Amino acid sequence: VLSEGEWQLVLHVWAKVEADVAGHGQDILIRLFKSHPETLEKFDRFKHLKTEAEMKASEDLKKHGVTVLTALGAILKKKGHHEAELKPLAQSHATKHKIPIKYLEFISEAIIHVLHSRHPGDFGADAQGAMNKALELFRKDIAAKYKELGYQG
Numbered sequence: 001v002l003s004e005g006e007w008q009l010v011l012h013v014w015a016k017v018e019a020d021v022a023g024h025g026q027d028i029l030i031r032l033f034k035s036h037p038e039t040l041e042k043f044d045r046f047k048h049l050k051t052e053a054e055m056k057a058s059e060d061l062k063k064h065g066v067t068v069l070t071a072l073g074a075i076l077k078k079k080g081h082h083e084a085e086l087k088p089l090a091q092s093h094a095t096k097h098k099i100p101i102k103y104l105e106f107i108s109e110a111i112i113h114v115l116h117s118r119h120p121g122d123f124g125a126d127a128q129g130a131m132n133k134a135l136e137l138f139r140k141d142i143a144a145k146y147k148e149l150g151y152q153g
């Protein structure tokens with residue numbers, strides 16, 4: 001579990017993300033798609049996009065980034081009590097979207113890179129450590145639901 005002090009490091013930096021959800025969501029998805037091109041192939045909506053410049057120009061991608069970060073924020077703010085929020089997400093990601101757990105690890109790494117670029121002063125090693133723990137918790141709970149339903153392990 002995270003301590004109360006580690007949750008406070010997480011949510012302090014997240015309040016800052018909430019100043020510009022759309023810009024954050026962009027940088028994260030672009031970083032994901034460039035670092036791990038195979039992830040872009042999951043998105044019928046985005047697979048036509050070939051360059052970073054086309055990505056940065058897509059309003060629909062920016063819209064999806066807000067969808068993603070809003071759902072994540074609602075989970076973080078539950079500070080681990082996130083069962084009701086996380087269940088619907090794991091079901092759709094397992095059964096509809098077919099998203100490997102490994103891809104959730106990839107987007108976690110994208111999230112941490114972008115927070116580090118945008119908020120150095122609020123995102124030192126101790127906050128980075130806390131955020132890494134929160135994302136691990138998120139992945140571990142999703143992984144449990146996947147296993148239940150019989151999805152890739």
Ligand code: HEM
Nearest residue numbers: 039042043045067068071072088089092097099103104107
């Ligand atoms: C932090 C992780 C993520 C969160 C919070 C998240 C959240 C969401 C939300 C809320 C939706 C819309 C409702 C639904 O279908 O459940 C969505 C859709 C989707 N997500 Fe995720 N997602 C995450 C990670 C990923 C990753 C890593 C991928 C793929 C590599 C992925 C692929 C998709 C696809 C294909 C859709 C549907 C897009 C469309 O409308 O066609 N998601 N996600």
